[PDB]
Scaffold this active site. Structure first.
Site, short mmCIF file in Angstrom:
data_model
loop_
_atom_site.label_atom_id
_atom_site.label_comp_id
_atom_site.label_asym_id
_atom_site.label_seq_id
_atom_site.Cartn_x
_atom_site.Cartn_y
_atom_site.Cartn_z
N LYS A 1 0.75 -1.26 0.00
CA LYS A 1 0.00 0.00 0.00
C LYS A 1 0.79 1.31 0.00
CE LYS A 1 -4.33 -1.75 1.97
NZ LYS A 1 -5.43 -1.48 2.94
N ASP B 1 -10.46 2.22 0.67
CA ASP B 1 -10.60 1.85 2.08
C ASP B 1 -11.36 2.95 2.83
OD1 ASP B 1 -9.30 -0.70 2.35
OD2 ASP B 1 -7.36 0.30 2.21
#
Ligand SMILES: NC(=O)c1ccc[n+]([C@@H]2O[C@H](COP(=O)([O-])OP(=O)(O)OC[C@H]3O[C@@H](n4cnc5c(N)ncnc54)[C@H](OP(=O)(O)O)[C@@H]3O)[C@@H](O)[C@H]2O)c1
Ligand SMILES: O=C(O)C1=C[C@@H](O)[C@@H](O)[C@H](O)C1
Ligand SMILES: O=C(O)C1=C[C@@H](O)[C@@H](O)[C@H](O)C1
Lengths: 263, 261
Positions: free
Chosen positions: B64, B100
């Site tokens: 990420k 997210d």
């Protein structure tokens, strides 16, 4: 559902609505592709509406060059060519691409027209720019001509091409009409038949009429020929893939365009 | 022709392949979604491949954060959060986004979880940053805690939030465990039972086990609770829309993930 559109002025005769209707249907997708008449003064307001109501849109004259500034991101090729014909909207952000360049290449290839140069592009305009760009990266020696020498010579350095006189056409293996000569003019052609090369191929971006004098003459001379519909179909299919990840049948899109033309 | 995959390590037990197989099927689309083990070092190259044969990919631990320095464009939100969990490929170019954060908010709404603060996010790591970003965007007063005080203090000043001692949990109305405490460990929780408030809601990003010690403590105290599956499903659905323009059923994807468990 998927909302698409072609923005430009005029767009009443665009074949995109018909091509993408086939794309949506043939792919079993729910959505629409409409033509939004959009002058250059309405580009800003239109793009803002795109950011919130459209997954993507195509851009036609006269919005291809004045669009780069209003987008959040513009592809390299699109920046060099200086034109964007395909806009993608994700999370309210707009990204600009040019599917004419790659569309042109895939059409030639799928059409059996070898990318064997030297290739000569007639016209140093927006249309010529996209084509000149594509042939280069494809691995061919490319020359450019323009009714007005000024333009041509300037485009030759920018891209790193060669501005040649019309006579040079005889030494080309790939001829591309990027001018509006012949557009709705069966009697007109930008290139005198005597200047046509022995062997090679010819492609005309003008598709109204489908078989232009340019192509007719090219065929009589024994050259391989391709109309302007294959490029139109691929740039549109490439745009659809860009928006959804799905590539509609280019042959099917060209056929849809053909039917819309009634020829 | 839609080729997708989740990049990270480990990803062997990822529930994404299941959720997305459902998305594709439910939408009458042909494609695939695979688990692709990828370590930090193998990332730079993995992305080159993505550019060639993948429409898009999800990134998880530990990719990420590093992914940003290897993309053509990164969304303003992904930039601020400092992490990308969703990548879109077009003309060989890579665009980074973060589903997210918006996924967490959609999960709360769909799950009947009231957006009422102060909200306390436990963990100042990548997940905590995404959650904090989302809660701040929603206008709630957000507090953050981290086992390592510095990480929370930095995030608080960075996002304009407030780093608090774990005891402030008794005054929070929304508690979110964004730490890895409790991951496959029913005996562990990041918050001592006595520090839980008696009113409010709790959400745990950890879904292995499904009913973590943290959520059981919260539920026992009378708080409304939500497991980590709704968020996992919504971030997945939003990513699918980023890739195709189509939004698969989040409930359906969550259901698929449940079964994959
Ligand atoms: N449901 C979903 O869709 C979803 C989405 C994202 C993440 N998650 C889950 O939520 C977690 C967060 O992931 P991540 O990317 O942020 O990174 P991570 O490496 O999983 O977690 C880092 C965080 O955990 C804290 N931590 C680790 N061990 C701890 C301990 N013994 N006591 C207290 N705090 C501890 C760290 O604090 P320090 O700074 O002190 O090390 C840091 O805040 C993961 O377990 C992941 O599986 C779920
Ligand atoms: O007529 C049309 O609808 C189009 C024409 C070309 O300029 C293409 O580049 C454009 O994407 C669509
Ligand atoms: O386990 C998984 O497959 C995932 C976990 C989260 O990090 C998500 O952000 C990611 O997109 C997918």
């Amino acid at each position: 559902m998927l909302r698409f559109a072609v923005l430009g002025h005029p767009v009443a005769h665009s074949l995109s609505p018909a091509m993408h209707a086939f794309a949506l249907e043939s792919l079993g997708l729910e959505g629409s592709y409409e033509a939004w008449d959009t002058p250059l003064e309405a580009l800003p307001g239109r793009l803002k509406e795109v950011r919130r109501a459209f997954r993507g849109v195509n851009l036609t004259l006269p919005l291809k060059e004045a669009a780069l500034a209003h987008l959040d991101w513009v592809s390299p090729e699109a920046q060099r060519i200086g034109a964007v014909n395909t806009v993608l909207q994700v999370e309210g952000r707009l990204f600009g691409f040019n599917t004419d360049a790659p569309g042109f290449l895939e059409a030639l290839k799928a059409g059996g027209i070898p990318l064997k140069g030297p290739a000569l592009v007639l016209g140093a305009g927006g249309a010529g720019r996209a084509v000149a760009f594509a042939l280069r990266e494809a691995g061919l020696e490319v020359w450019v001509w323009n009714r007005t020498p000024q333009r041509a010579l300037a485009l030759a350095e920018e891209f790193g091409l060669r501005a040649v006189p019309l006579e040079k056409a005889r030494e080309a293996r790939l001829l591309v009409n990027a001018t509006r000569v012949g557009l709705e003019d069966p009697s007109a052609s930008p290139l005198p038949a005597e200047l046509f090369p022995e062997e090679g191929a010819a492609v005309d971006l003008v598709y109204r009429p489908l078989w232009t004098r340019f192509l007719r003459e090219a065929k009589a001379k024994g050259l391989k020929v391709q109309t302007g519909l294959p490029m139109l179909a691929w740039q549109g299919a490439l745009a659809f893939r860009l928006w959804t990840g799905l590539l509609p049948d280019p042959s099917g899109m060209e056929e849809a365009a053909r039917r819309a033309l009634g020829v």
